[PDB]
RNA sequence: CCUUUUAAUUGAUUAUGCUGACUUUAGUCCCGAUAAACUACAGUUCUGCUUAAACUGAGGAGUCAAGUAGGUACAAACCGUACAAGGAUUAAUU
RNA sequence: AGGGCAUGCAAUACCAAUCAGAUAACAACUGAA
RNA sequence: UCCUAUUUCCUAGUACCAUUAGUGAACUCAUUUGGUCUGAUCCUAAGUACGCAGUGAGCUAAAUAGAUACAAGGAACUUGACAAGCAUUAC
RNA sequence: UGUAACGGUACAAGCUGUAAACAAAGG
RNA sequence: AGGAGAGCGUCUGUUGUACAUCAACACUAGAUACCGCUAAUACCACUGUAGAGGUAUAGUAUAUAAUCCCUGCCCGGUGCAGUAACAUGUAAACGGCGGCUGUUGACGGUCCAAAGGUAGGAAAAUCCUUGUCGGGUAAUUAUCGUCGUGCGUGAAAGUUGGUCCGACUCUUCACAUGUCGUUUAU
RNA sequence: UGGGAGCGAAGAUAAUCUAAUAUGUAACUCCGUUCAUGGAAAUCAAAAGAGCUUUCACUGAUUGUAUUUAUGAAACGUGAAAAAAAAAAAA
RNA sequence: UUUUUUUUUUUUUUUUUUUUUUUUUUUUU
RNA sequence: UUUUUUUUUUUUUUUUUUUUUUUUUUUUUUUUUUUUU
RNA sequence: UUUUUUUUUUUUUU
């Protein structure tokens, strides 16, 4: 959306967003130190957030916490006959998610490419135009240091497999963040090295205890989470160094990361996304998918597989449309030197 | 500078002509219409009109959080004029002094006296919260809904609301030379009150002049508010001048009288 | 892309609603037009600053400033009074052109300040020979608007106009005539000469557009002779198409007054001509919105307390009546004011006298109530009721209206000032009674 | 010519190509006036 | 095969043809060709004072 | 061709085209367009027609035939 | 999205049309002004014993320093000289294009108001 | 087309039995014209039917000559 | 005339040959769903279909084509026809 | 050639790096004619 | 003096261009009577308190394309139940 | 330079450019 | 376009075809392979764009076809993965899987091989244009049931199939009927 | 324009096929033709000697490249037409 | 009632066309 | 739930922008600074 | 899809 000069950057000369209030920078420095000490005083928890602890907290949250027993009879629009069969799943006052519209000032229109490059030719096959979508302004950088923020509601992201959260700071500014499995409307978060080891809290890798479940880990200092963002994904702390932190990713891969980078504590929301079963091809049609035609039912010129008839068999290895093997054939530059990768 | 540029009256697009199908779009465009703005937005929009209320809402904590919930609600916003002309001078001055005290406390924060201040703020906040929350009513109640509820649409109950006439010889002598020479509906109790709210309807003064300028087909028989409309809705003996302020959270109605609970009412 | 069935319906209905709404807006819009005209052949080229130092200003500067202020509608007392003060100092170095501009500005602004008019009049009188059409027109036009009669100077203006007829503009000539007739300063001979020149002017250098401006009921019946009357009446018929309600009203009024006052001349008209006027009356003529005055309301309250039924406002064919009794329709009252009389005097205006006589002729029991007499009563209701009762038992006014006693600026000012506080105290008392003040909070 | 195709082509009069030939009604050998 | 004057004028008009990599030497009835047409002939026995010959080179 | 100047159609005109084509016949501007579709007209750009008085003019369009002989006779005197 | 993409001039950042209400910084102004000012910095040359003629006849002029020049009336060419070829009447009339104020003359004719007020 | 440029000459080649007659519409049109002249008071049909050198003042014809023996 | 010469491309029933005319097949084939009446003393023929209201304070609820297709003497000719202010207040004249 | 001579052919080239248009702040930014 | 305040506001003669206001696919195409018929809407209609539209003559041959009515038997026809038939009959 | 459109001429494959087939006489 | 038996079988949806007149493609589902960000892959002006302003519950590639059902053996073999710096692991990736002879024959001899058709179905979208017996008819070789030899197919190559389902072949029942022997009238 | 510069394939011949010829030919872009191109020797020749550049004839279809099909105005040399080293240290 | 003009939205120029003829000492009357 | 519109302009709010600005058209009304409330 | 005195410019919204 934005210009290349406005979006492209290699080197970063800052890792925080400063919003001073005093007339002079000398006073602002003292104010920042006071805020940091205030957050340090409040911080109390330092134990690692393990899977077992996560489980135990989830059991408490989803066993007894939710009890209101409300009078839903009065919570409805009186005198509205409604549709002739069409009814919502649940009322807005009992739904998990917010029954509304995304913020106008935190969203924009989505440019649909249809899987086409500048040349105008089809690049990405099987790409349809489904339901209209809006790009969300997700705040990946926690620039707001030494400040608390409470959660107002949880939103749905069509573009992501996880849920979002509407964060509001004390000053009254609204921002979007990646929600968690634990976080519920009303919970408070803070981004600071002196903060406690709690869900939602963002702390450096180095400060984060060992054997701690984390997510939204950034590659470079102050760049944003790229290695793990999807729902149900998380990383683990293995080892620690004076300048490096060893992390186990979701793909069972061991890699070292800088000690200076930031990371979030917890698990991405919507853990049960891989349990839905589509009852008909209409779901795929609405999602923006297209039918896939196998190469077997193609002409020899169209596809190598064409013409040649045969079942599983063992003589002639299969060939893709591109003339390249697709079974156990590694696709990686052997010359590319391994970096911070420990175990691949 | 294209194939077609006609607009407005000359709309190139073709629309349905069937009255049956047309009768269904009006329902969707009026009743099932969606609103983005919240109740607070609506309230704020008329800050000028209700400054007292606008300030109390943002001054006393708790009310702001309560009036932002997803559940349907119904709100009444009394007017400054109504407040002024209803409330006695001493009560009005005392209320304004406490609102200013809370605003000053917040300004001091953002910028045995210490012990007494805590008790004073604790008592004043509860009193104002109680006062404020009294107006709030669960559920969505529309003007039409109330009107119909009050028996406005029942032919057996519309006898005193349909046939209205006045002396035409006194107001239009030139056009007449031959002559020369309801029920109570009970609403759910408020959030901070157990007592129900009675609502009724009344005939306006203007309604008694329609026949002089309209075609009437009546059968054979055998102070006054200046607000417009044929019918006047009285919600607990407060007249409604404006209503149908639909929002994402409910509806807002402006009444010409401040509703005060018995707990605050004197002996 | 694709939309949800639910949303689709709502969007289509909304869209339809839009169309309906748009169709429903341009109903009453009849007289509108995308095209419009703006007058631009009057602004000066030079740039000035209204907010500048008046001392550094000159005649030229001040003249410009005055007109620019007027055009921009920058009504500021503090600003205008400084202009007046500097003008008084620079009164002896004003060109005829500048004077005219000044006058026009003042008049357009409606800046009621006699102190300046009275001081600038004598210098105009001396510079009359060097005056031009525009200046001459603006002087009178301003004077008329501000309602400051000057029979000594206005007459001179007219005479200079007649002298410079060969150089004057039809429009300015017409406006001069109109002004003169309204102010009532033209002897018979002057009137006659004016009429004679006007007829030739109208018949030689006037069009449809320019002719319409010559129509005036007050002027027609007090300035215009029979020969011009007949020609005016006949040409109006022909030029009616290119007219406005404002001219229509005047025309109708003219017709009525002519019929009522001059039967002979009326009969002298042709059948065709007569028919026009006959049919005219039958049509609905638009009128501006009207409402009672505070004085009107006070009088009405006193009258109602006395125990008499009446109306507030109503039209009667071609004339408005202040008060009309229901028990006896014949009866009628009229509430006067400062504007009803000339500045610093109690003399009635020509239009007021003409309307009084027309109704008196037609048989209307007409009564008049002054404001300077009324103000004296104060905020007492019994005194006003007795005042009204004493008037009621007395006979009505004569056909011919007369003027009141002498007055002065001092007195005028005093009266105005006095009334200022009465109109506020009565409003406060009225407004206070509406407040019940019953509710008492424990707190 | 389509919009996309037309947006990447110059005018023929922008070049000297128009003064490199002698085609005329007489034939293929045109001599300019006053030559 | 539809009739579209807009299309026709936007793709096949006088200003659209000039952008075409075609043989402009061919004569065109409704086009701006680039073929020279030899002009007015020599003079016989008429008045020498009224023989026109130039304009854009002589305009003043 | 079906469409275009090839059958005596001539150049395209407003009449023979869809709604929206802008093409006049030569005129003089008398105003400007606003930001809402209105048009403010100015009287300053209107031309002025100058005509002398013709109330008393002895001259006529044509000349009497007898003029020729009188003019001719004057020439012979110079010989 | 239309086929307008790919062109380098597509959605260009900053333009003639875009920028219609933006003014240059005072830095530029100052720079320019200073540059222009600093183009003729040098010491005096020639000779100036006596003051420049800047006052009327009789009255001396030594202290009254004048920045502006003054033109002499007695030094101007006449209309006859102007209209003469290369090799009352117009022998004593001059048509000058300049500031009247800045002219040394014996008398000057001025149009005052009737009240004679400046 | 008046210009004679379309393919409307193709069908005409083949023989036909007959064609429609818009008598209903034509009659109406004629009637309207007749009425429009009658309101003024001039007979059009009469003039469209009278013999070349025939003179018939008013509503008169052959029948008129019957009783007018003298 | 005779005699010498000629780079004329110089020679015809035929390439289903190219460009035209004119015979035979051959007075053969082709003809669209519903008409009638207009008198010698008054009148309303039958049938198919069924949005045919033109001030009622509101520009008849739209787009497009016709490169002007319901004007005009039983004319495939000539000559006319597009008014957003509705010009006829033409309720008068004779 | 005495006088006159609407309009269109997209024109700062009687000069001056290249690359859209009334011929483009640097850079991004690329080239067989 | 008990109105929610008794806060003046009809309408400036008006640049350039489009238009046949009704029924009808009026568009490509062409074996083109423009307009009747062939299908849903637009009018609280005994089909809208008379609306639109309707093109030579004659004649018992046979065959062919269709409609109505067929004794008894009721798939014996055909590769095949193709086709045809039933779905209206005291009121 | 070479050409296209509109207007006039007798509406035209010519001529012509609203001054649209001519100024011929400056003492 | 009806009642009943039985063979085959995910349609709705797209389209006239890989032979003997009787098809395909797509899909709800499962499973395999590649890829840690300037990702893989694609266009093939190369410091570009799509992928994607996405981040291993993500992206892309190949093959199969129901929500479930128990789903056989084989790495001698091309290729890929790995490295003794050419063991070993991948058959839901990549062709497939058998002779003599003796007692209806559990059993015994011998040759060869990586392994030596598993179960189920079975006169078949396959052998053969009349396999035995039973149900229908005055006649049934057409067709259902069954036997499992006559030739033979063959398991995430998709086999078998309870219930439900049907614009898919065929058997058979019922009403009317000019299809008819065999042709008439308007 | 068969002139000069960049890039530059195929039909065809070799009775199919490679090289090769076609051909550095066709299409595309640019210079615009005697006021042009070119150029006054570190050249050619061999033991004599010619003396910037350019056109024609002969030597000669000789030498050479190819071979299964072709291509080749070769170098020295002779004849002839046209003939051209430099205006010049400044005033 | 449209077209024209701002926005969508584009020198993605509809030859003989435009609020577009050299761009305010305009003689304000 | 397959997760849907907003800029020109209108209204409201907040102001130290400007003849690039509303007839030298017209009506009504008790009325307005500083040394008359 | 902007409606009546013309421009520049900021927030919210049925």
Author numbering:
A (entry chain LO): 1 to 344
B (entry chain LE): 367 to 477, 491 to 560, 595 to 635, 660 to 704
C (entry chain LJ): 2 to 444
D (entry chain UD): 168 to 202
E (entry chain Ln): 130 to 189
F (entry chain LI): 12 to 90
G (entry chain LC): 104 to 190, 232 to 262
H (entry chain LQ): 348 to 417
How does the study describe this entry?
Our study reveals how Toxoplasma gondii assembles over 40 mt-rRNA fragments using exclusively nuclear-encoded mitoribosomal proteins and three lineage-specific families of RNA-binding proteins. Cryo-EM analysis of the mitoribosome structure demonstrates how these AP2 proteins function as RNA binders to maintain mitoribosome integrity. The mitoribosome is also decorated with members of lineage-specific RNA-binding proteins belonging to RAP (RNA-binding domain abundant in Apicomplexa) proteins and HPR (heptatricopeptide repeat) families, highlighting the unique adaptations of these parasites. Our results reveal the structure and composition of the most fragmented rRNA mitoribosome to date.
The samples were fractionated by sucrose gradient, and the fractions corresponding to mt-LSU and monosome complexes were combined and their cryo-EM structures resolved. The LSU was resolved to 2.89 Å, and the entire mitoribosome was locally refined to three bodies, the SSU head, the SSU body and the LSU, at resolutions of 3.6 Å, 3.29 Å and 3.11 Å, respectively. As for the LSU rRNA fragments, the peptidyl transferase center (PTC) region is nearly strictly conserved compared to any ribosome and is recapitulated by LSUD/E the center piece of the LSU, engaged in base-pairing interactions with RNA3, LSUF/G, RNA13, RNA1 and SSUF. While RNA domains II and III are largely reduced, with a dozen helices, compared to the bacterial counterpart, domains IV and V are mostly conserved where the rRNA fragments recapitulate most of the conserved helices, and Domains I and VI appear highly fragmented but most of the key features are retained. The CP consists of the conserved mitoribosomal proteins mL40, mL46, mL59/64, which are found in other species, as well as Myzozoa-specific mtRPs mL155, mL163, mL173, and mtAP2-3. Despite the lack of a 5S rRNA, the 5’ of RNA29 extends out and towards the top of the CP and is tightly embedded in several ribosomal proteins, mainly mL40. The remaining three mtAP2s (mtAP2-2 to mtAP2-4) are positioned on the LSU: one at the central protuberance, another above the nascent peptide channel exit on the solvent side, and the third below the PTC on the inter-subunit side. The mtAP2-3 is located at the CP and directly interacts with the 3’ ends of RNA13 and RNA29 and the 5’ end of RNA38. Finally, the L1-stalk rRNA, invariably formed by helices 76, 77 and 78 could not be mapped to any rRNA fragments in our structure, as the position of L1-stalk remains completely unoccupied by any rRNA or protein structure.
